[PDB]
Structures are given as structure tokens and as C-alpha cells.
Amino acid sequence: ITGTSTVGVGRGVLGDQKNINTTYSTYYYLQDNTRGNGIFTYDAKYRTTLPGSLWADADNQFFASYDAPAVDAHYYAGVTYDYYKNVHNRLSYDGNNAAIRSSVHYSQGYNNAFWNGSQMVYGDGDGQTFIPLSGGIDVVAHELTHAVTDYTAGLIYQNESGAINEAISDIFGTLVEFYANKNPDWEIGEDVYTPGISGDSLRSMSDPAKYGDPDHYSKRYTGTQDNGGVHINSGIINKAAYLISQGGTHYGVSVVGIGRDKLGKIFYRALTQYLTPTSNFSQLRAAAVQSATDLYGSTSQEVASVKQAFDAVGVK
Ligand SMILES: CC[C@H](C)[C@H](N)C(=O)N[C@@H](CCCC[NH3+])C(=O)O
Ligand SMILES: [Ca+2]
Ligand SMILES: [Ca+2]
Ligand SMILES: [Ca+2]
Ligand SMILES: [Ca+2]
Ligand SMILES: [Zn+2]
């Protein structure tokens, strides 16, 4: 909508107060004009028609229970935009400041969040399995990273290419969570999963097998569920990424960690310069090797650690 840029205040899903960028034109809308062509947050009103209505508020204060998922979707889309721009010099998901659109209050009791090819979509959860999913910075950043991937490598969402697609979303979802630097970890979705259970998450990058996912190629899933295991086999790549950053010894193979910033540089370059729609895990190793060679040199520690990490998870 055309209007003037304003700054509202509200509370997110976990009860934290934050300032949000809004636009005033009769109402105050969740439209942030400070980032690219805008960040826009919509109310799906418990239905499944998308995007729904651009979020309108009479007083620029967003402290109602019903407001909290919107506050966080909007705010965390901003953080994710800032990460890509400031860390990777990328302007929005398409690299040309595309508008970022999100809908909250999708359906009733909906225990998921997704990128639909055009926008973000967040359920409220059923209150037991999940609370509203935009409360998780890693979740927001995971979903927006699918838009990045779709515009860049274009990894097909099935089988090994799909597991790479998922891992890239977990990797950058986690790196955004560290960038924001509130309560960061190498777990996925802990802040919105199972409010009645402390210390769990959907997936772990540090130990995928904690939640039943493979941590070595020899344990890969080859059945048909989950688009050929895209959220299962992502554990193999997530473990490799974790080892590259943090180091460790895994199945007897020792990796020297090179830290999060270099992990991010290597995988961002692989995603944007080397991966293709049909890349498999072997091809990802090659892309990450080439990317680290570009950035650091063929005889670098960084290249060595990339190779050691893929070796550790059985990917040649
Ligand atoms: C990043 C987390 C986000 C919810 C994502 N769409 C996801 O990982 N979903 C998988 C895990 C289950 C989520 C709730 N049932 C999924 O399999 O869809
Ligand atoms: Ca209000
Ligand atoms: Ca966390
Ligand atoms: Ca996390
Ligand atoms: Ca929990
Ligand atoms: Zn995903």
C-alpha cells in the first residue's frame, strides 16, 4: 500500500517485545519499506486461501495474542534479509530486492511452515506439537532459504538433490539464528516445538541420529516417504556442515573446524555458483571443494576440512 513508513511495537510468540517496521495509510500495516521492495505480512485468518489480507492494525501496537505470530514472521523476515545482504551481499531471495511476503494463521492447528513458490506460510500449531511456527528464527530463515535455493541452484525437491535443498535451509536457518545471536544452537525449531518438553527439537545438525536421522551415507534412506527422505537424508549433509564449522571426530575421522563464517561463505558460493537442479551428494562435495578452493586456495586448511568432513559422513 502507499503510505508513510512508521515504527510499531509488539510482542512475539515467546513474549519478547520488539519494534517492527510498518506503513501508515488509515491503518498501520505490516509493510516494512526499509528492506528492498518491502517485507509484507498477511493474515490468513485460519483459512488456506493465500495470501489473505495485508495485516492491518488500528494503533501500531501489536500486543494481542493473535498479533504475536505476525510480529515474529515480519521481524524475522527482516533479520533474514539483513543476514543475506550484510553477510553475502545478496539483496533478497532473488538478488534483486524481491518483496518478501509471509502469511500467518494458516489453517487450524497446522503443525508446519513452508515456502509455496511465492511466499512464506506459517501455521499456528496445535498447541501441543507446535506453537506458532514463526516464533522460531531458524524456521523463518529455513523457509526463506528455500526461496534463495529455488532462484539459484534450483535443487529438485526429491532424493539426494532434495536432501541437499533441505540441508541448505537448515544450514542457513542456523547461521541466521547465530547472526541474530539471541539463543543460538545447531538444533532446528527448538523454540516452537513441543512447549511441554524441554530440550528437544525437530532435527539436530550436531547429532542427527538424536531424532532418527542418518549421520553417514551408509545409513541413507532409499524408500519413497518424504519425497525420498529429504528431511531424513539431510542429516548426512547437516552433519558434514556441522563438522566443517565446529570440528570433531565422527566414525573415527577427525575434522578440524574452520568456524561458522567460513562454513557460510563456502556453502553460499557452492549454492550460487556450482550446484545445479540435479546435484547429488557427490556433486555437493565437489562444489564445496571448488568453492573453498576459490576462496582459500587448494592447499588450505579450509579445503582440507571440507574433504575431511565429507569423508567423515561417507560422501566421496
Ligand atoms: C524448518 C522447520 C519447518 C517446520 C520445515 N517445513 C520442516 O522441516 N518440516 C518438516 C518437519 C515437520 C514439521 C512439522 N510436522 C516436514 O517434514 O514437513
Ligand atoms: Ca493494535
Ligand atoms: Ca535456539
Ligand atoms: Ca535452532
Ligand atoms: Ca520442546
Ligand atoms: Zn524445508
Coordinates of C-alpha atoms and ligand atoms in Angstrom, one line a residue:
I1 CA 0.0 0.0 0.0
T2 CA 1.2 3.6 -0.5
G3 CA 1.8 5.3 2.8
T4 CA 4.4 6.6 5.2
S5 CA 6.9 4.5 7.0
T6 CA 6.3 4.1 10.7
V7 CA 7.7 2.0 13.6
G8 CA 5.3 -0.1 15.6
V9 CA 5.9 -2.1 18.8
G10 CA 4.6 -5.5 19.8
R11 CA 5.3 -8.9 21.4
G12 CA 6.3 -12.1 19.6
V13 CA 5.2 -15.7 20.1
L14 CA 7.6 -16.2 23.1
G15 CA 6.5 -12.9 24.8
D16 CA 9.5 -10.8 23.8
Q17 CA 8.9 -7.1 22.9
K18 CA 10.3 -5.8 19.6
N19 CA 9.9 -2.9 17.2
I20 CA 8.5 -3.6 13.8
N21 CA 8.6 -1.5 10.6
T22 CA 5.1 -0.6 9.5
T23 CA 3.3 1.6 6.9
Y24 CA 0.5 4.1 7.8
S25 CA -2.4 4.7 5.5
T26 CA -5.6 4.9 7.6
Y27 CA -4.4 1.7 9.3
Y28 CA -0.9 0.7 10.2
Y29 CA 0.1 -2.2 8.0
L30 CA 2.8 -4.9 8.4
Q31 CA 4.7 -3.5 5.5
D32 CA 8.4 -2.8 6.0
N33 CA 9.6 -0.3 3.4
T34 CA 13.2 -0.2 4.8
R35 CA 14.3 -3.5 3.1
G36 CA 14.4 -3.9 -0.6
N37 CA 11.0 -3.7 -2.3
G38 CA 9.4 -4.4 1.0
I39 CA 8.5 -7.1 3.6
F40 CA 4.8 -7.7 3.7
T41 CA 3.0 -9.8 6.3
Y42 CA -0.6 -11.1 5.8
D43 CA -3.4 -12.7 7.9
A44 CA -4.7 -16.0 6.5
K45 CA -7.5 -15.9 9.2
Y46 CA -7.4 -19.6 9.9
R47 CA -8.1 -20.4 6.3
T48 CA -6.0 -21.7 3.4
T49 CA -6.6 -19.0 0.8
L50 CA -3.3 -17.2 0.2
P51 CA -2.0 -14.8 0.9
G52 CA -5.0 -13.4 2.7
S53 CA -5.2 -9.8 3.9
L54 CA -2.2 -7.5 4.3
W55 CA -2.1 -7.2 8.1
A56 CA -3.9 -4.1 9.3
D57 CA -3.8 -2.7 12.8
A58 CA -5.6 0.4 14.1
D59 CA -3.0 1.7 16.6
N60 CA 0.5 0.4 15.6
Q61 CA 0.7 -1.7 18.8
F62 CA 0.8 -5.4 18.4
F63 CA 0.5 -6.9 21.9
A64 CA -2.6 -9.1 21.3
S65 CA -2.2 -12.9 21.4
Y66 CA -3.5 -13.0 17.8
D67 CA -0.8 -10.5 16.8
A68 CA 2.2 -12.5 18.0
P69 CA 2.8 -14.8 15.0
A70 CA 2.6 -11.8 12.7
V71 CA 5.1 -9.8 14.7
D72 CA 7.6 -12.6 14.6
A73 CA 7.1 -13.5 10.9
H74 CA 7.6 -9.9 10.0
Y75 CA 10.6 -9.2 12.3
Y76 CA 12.4 -12.5 11.5
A77 CA 12.0 -12.0 7.7
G78 CA 13.8 -8.7 8.3
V79 CA 16.6 -10.4 10.2
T80 CA 16.9 -13.0 7.4
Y81 CA 17.0 -10.2 4.7
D82 CA 19.7 -8.5 6.8
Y83 CA 21.8 -11.6 7.1
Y84 CA 21.8 -12.2 3.3
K85 CA 22.5 -8.6 2.5
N86 CA 25.2 -7.9 5.1
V87 CA 27.0 -11.3 5.1
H88 CA 26.6 -12.4 1.5
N89 CA 25.9 -9.1 -0.3
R90 CA 22.6 -10.7 -1.6
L91 CA 19.5 -8.4 -1.9
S92 CA 16.5 -10.5 -1.0
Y93 CA 15.9 -14.1 -2.2
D94 CA 16.2 -13.3 -5.9
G95 CA 19.3 -11.0 -5.6
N96 CA 17.2 -8.0 -6.9
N97 CA 15.2 -7.0 -3.8
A98 CA 12.1 -9.1 -4.4
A99 CA 9.3 -8.4 -2.0
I100 CA 9.2 -10.9 0.9
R101 CA 5.7 -12.0 1.7
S102 CA 4.5 -14.1 4.6
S103 CA 1.1 -15.3 5.8
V104 CA 0.4 -16.3 9.4
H105 CA -2.6 -18.0 11.0
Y106 CA -2.7 -20.5 8.1
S107 CA -5.4 -23.1 8.6
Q108 CA -6.4 -24.5 12.0
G109 CA -3.9 -26.4 14.3
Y110 CA -1.4 -26.5 11.4
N111 CA 1.9 -28.0 12.6
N112 CA 4.2 -26.8 9.8
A113 CA 5.5 -23.8 7.8
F114 CA 6.5 -23.7 4.2
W115 CA 7.6 -21.7 1.2
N116 CA 4.9 -22.1 -1.5
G117 CA 6.9 -20.9 -4.5
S118 CA 5.9 -17.3 -3.9
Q119 CA 5.7 -16.6 -0.2
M120 CA 6.1 -17.9 3.3
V121 CA 3.3 -19.6 5.1
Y122 CA 3.1 -20.3 8.9
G123 CA 0.7 -22.5 10.9
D124 CA -0.2 -21.8 14.5
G125 CA 0.5 -25.3 15.6
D126 CA -2.0 -27.4 17.6
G127 CA -0.5 -26.0 20.9
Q128 CA 1.0 -29.4 21.8
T129 CA 3.3 -30.4 18.9
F130 CA 4.0 -26.8 18.0
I131 CA 3.2 -23.2 18.9
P132 CA 3.0 -20.7 16.1
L133 CA 6.0 -21.5 13.9
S134 CA 7.2 -18.0 13.1
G135 CA 8.4 -17.9 16.7
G136 CA 11.5 -19.8 15.5
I137 CA 14.1 -17.6 13.8
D138 CA 15.7 -20.8 12.4
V139 CA 12.3 -21.8 11.0
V140 CA 11.7 -18.5 9.3
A141 CA 15.2 -18.4 7.8
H142 CA 15.0 -22.1 6.8
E143 CA 11.8 -21.3 4.8
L144 CA 13.1 -18.1 3.2
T145 CA 16.3 -20.0 2.2
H146 CA 14.1 -22.3 0.1
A147 CA 13.3 -19.2 -2.0
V148 CA 17.1 -18.5 -2.3
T149 CA 17.7 -22.0 -3.4
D150 CA 14.9 -22.0 -5.9
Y151 CA 16.3 -18.8 -7.5
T152 CA 19.9 -20.2 -7.6
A153 CA 20.9 -23.8 -7.6
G154 CA 17.2 -24.9 -8.1
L155 CA 17.7 -28.3 -6.4
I156 CA 14.8 -30.6 -7.3
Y157 CA 12.9 -31.5 -4.1
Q158 CA 13.3 -35.2 -4.2
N159 CA 16.0 -37.8 -3.4
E160 CA 19.6 -36.6 -2.9
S161 CA 19.1 -33.2 -4.5
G162 CA 16.1 -32.6 -2.2
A163 CA 18.1 -33.6 0.8
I164 CA 20.7 -31.1 -0.2
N165 CA 17.9 -28.5 -0.6
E166 CA 16.7 -29.2 2.9
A167 CA 20.2 -29.2 4.4
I168 CA 20.9 -25.8 2.9
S169 CA 17.8 -24.5 4.5
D170 CA 18.9 -26.0 7.9
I171 CA 22.4 -24.7 7.5
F172 CA 21.4 -21.1 6.7
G173 CA 18.5 -21.2 9.1
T174 CA 21.1 -22.0 11.8
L175 CA 23.6 -19.4 10.5
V176 CA 20.8 -16.7 10.7
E177 CA 20.0 -17.8 14.2
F178 CA 23.7 -17.3 15.1
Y179 CA 23.7 -13.9 13.3
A180 CA 20.8 -12.7 15.4
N181 CA 22.7 -14.1 18.4
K182 CA 19.9 -14.5 20.9
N183 CA 19.8 -18.2 21.9
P184 CA 21.7 -19.9 19.0
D185 CA 22.3 -23.6 18.6
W186 CA 22.8 -26.3 16.0
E187 CA 19.2 -27.6 16.6
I188 CA 16.2 -26.9 14.3
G189 CA 12.9 -25.5 15.6
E190 CA 13.5 -25.9 19.3
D191 CA 11.8 -22.6 20.2
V192 CA 8.4 -23.6 18.7
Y193 CA 8.4 -27.4 19.1
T194 CA 6.7 -29.3 21.9
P195 CA 6.1 -26.5 24.5
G196 CA 5.5 -29.2 27.1
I197 CA 9.0 -30.8 26.6
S198 CA 12.3 -29.1 27.3
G199 CA 15.5 -29.7 25.3
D200 CA 14.1 -31.3 22.1
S201 CA 13.9 -30.1 18.5
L202 CA 12.8 -31.3 15.1
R203 CA 16.3 -32.1 13.9
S204 CA 19.8 -31.8 15.2
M205 CA 22.8 -30.9 13.0
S206 CA 25.3 -31.8 15.6
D207 CA 23.9 -35.3 16.1
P208 CA 21.2 -36.1 13.5
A209 CA 20.7 -39.6 15.0
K210 CA 19.3 -38.0 18.2
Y211 CA 16.0 -37.7 16.2
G212 CA 16.4 -40.8 14.0
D213 CA 18.2 -39.2 11.0
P214 CA 21.3 -40.6 9.3
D215 CA 24.7 -39.2 10.1
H216 CA 26.6 -41.3 7.5
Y217 CA 25.9 -42.2 3.8
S218 CA 25.8 -45.9 4.6
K219 CA 22.6 -45.1 6.7
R220 CA 20.8 -43.2 4.0
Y221 CA 17.1 -43.8 3.5
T222 CA 16.2 -45.0 0.0
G223 CA 12.5 -45.5 0.3
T224 CA 9.7 -43.3 -1.1
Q225 CA 8.4 -41.5 2.1
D226 CA 9.1 -37.8 2.5
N227 CA 10.0 -37.3 -1.2
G228 CA 12.6 -39.9 -0.9
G229 CA 13.8 -38.8 2.6
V230 CA 14.5 -35.1 2.0
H231 CA 14.2 -34.2 5.8
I232 CA 15.9 -37.5 6.8
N233 CA 18.9 -37.7 4.5
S234 CA 19.5 -34.0 5.1
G235 CA 21.2 -35.3 8.3
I236 CA 24.2 -36.5 6.4
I237 CA 24.8 -33.1 4.9
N238 CA 23.9 -31.3 8.1
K239 CA 26.5 -33.4 10.0
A240 CA 29.1 -32.5 7.4
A241 CA 28.3 -28.8 7.7
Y242 CA 28.5 -29.0 11.5
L243 CA 31.9 -30.8 11.3
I244 CA 33.3 -28.2 8.8
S245 CA 32.3 -25.4 11.3
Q246 CA 32.9 -27.0 14.7
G247 CA 35.2 -29.9 14.0
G248 CA 35.0 -33.3 15.7
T249 CA 35.8 -37.0 15.2
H250 CA 33.0 -38.9 13.6
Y251 CA 33.2 -42.7 13.0
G252 CA 37.0 -42.3 13.6
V253 CA 37.5 -39.5 11.1
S254 CA 38.8 -36.2 12.6
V255 CA 37.8 -32.8 11.1
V256 CA 39.4 -29.5 12.0
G257 CA 36.7 -26.9 12.4
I258 CA 37.0 -23.6 10.5
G259 CA 34.1 -21.7 12.1
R260 CA 30.6 -20.6 11.0
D261 CA 31.6 -17.6 8.9
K262 CA 33.7 -19.8 6.6
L263 CA 31.1 -22.5 6.5
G264 CA 28.6 -19.9 5.3
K265 CA 31.0 -18.5 2.7
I266 CA 31.8 -21.9 1.3
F267 CA 28.2 -23.1 1.1
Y268 CA 26.8 -19.8 -0.2
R269 CA 29.3 -19.9 -3.0
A270 CA 28.5 -23.6 -3.7
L271 CA 24.8 -22.8 -3.8
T272 CA 25.1 -19.9 -6.1
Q273 CA 28.0 -20.9 -8.4
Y274 CA 28.2 -24.7 -8.6
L275 CA 25.1 -26.6 -7.5
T276 CA 22.5 -27.5 -10.2
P277 CA 18.9 -28.8 -10.0
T278 CA 20.1 -32.4 -10.2
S279 CA 23.2 -32.2 -7.9
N280 CA 23.7 -35.3 -5.8
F281 CA 25.7 -35.6 -2.6
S282 CA 29.0 -36.5 -4.5
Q283 CA 28.4 -33.3 -6.6
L284 CA 27.9 -31.3 -3.5
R285 CA 31.2 -32.4 -2.2
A286 CA 32.8 -31.3 -5.5
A287 CA 31.0 -28.0 -5.3
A288 CA 32.1 -27.3 -1.8
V289 CA 35.7 -28.3 -2.6
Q290 CA 35.7 -26.0 -5.6
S291 CA 34.2 -23.1 -3.6
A292 CA 36.7 -23.5 -0.7
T293 CA 39.5 -23.6 -3.3
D294 CA 38.2 -20.4 -4.9
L295 CA 38.1 -18.6 -1.6
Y296 CA 41.1 -20.1 0.3
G297 CA 43.3 -22.0 -2.1
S298 CA 43.7 -25.6 -3.0
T299 CA 46.3 -26.4 -0.2
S300 CA 44.3 -24.5 2.5
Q301 CA 43.0 -25.9 5.8
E302 CA 39.6 -24.9 4.7
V303 CA 39.7 -27.2 1.6
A304 CA 41.2 -30.0 3.8
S305 CA 38.4 -29.7 6.3
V306 CA 35.8 -29.8 3.7
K307 CA 37.2 -33.0 2.3
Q308 CA 37.6 -34.5 5.8
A309 CA 34.0 -33.7 6.7
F310 CA 32.6 -35.3 3.6
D311 CA 34.9 -38.3 4.2
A312 CA 33.6 -38.5 7.8
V313 CA 30.0 -38.8 6.6
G314 CA 30.8 -41.3 3.8
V315 CA 30.3 -39.0 0.8
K316 CA 33.0 -39.3 -1.8
Ligands
LIG1 C1 12.2 -25.7 9.5 C2 11.1 -26.4 10.0 C3 9.9 -26.3 9.1 C4 8.8 -26.7 10.0 C5 10.0 -27.2 7.9 N1 8.9 -27.0 6.9 C6 10.2 -28.7 8.2 O1 11.4 -29.1 8.5 N2 9.2 -29.5 8.1 C7 9.4 -30.9 8.3 C8 9.3 -31.4 9.7 C9 7.9 -31.5 10.3 C10 7.4 -30.2 10.5 C11 6.0 -30.3 11.2 N3 5.3 -31.5 11.0 C12 8.3 -31.7 7.4 O2 8.5 -32.9 7.3 O3 7.5 -31.1 6.8
CA2 CA -3.2 -2.9 17.8
CA3 CA 18.0 -21.6 19.7
CA4 CA 18.0 -23.5 16.4
CA5 CA 10.0 -28.6 23.2
ZN6 ZN 12.4 -27.1 4.2

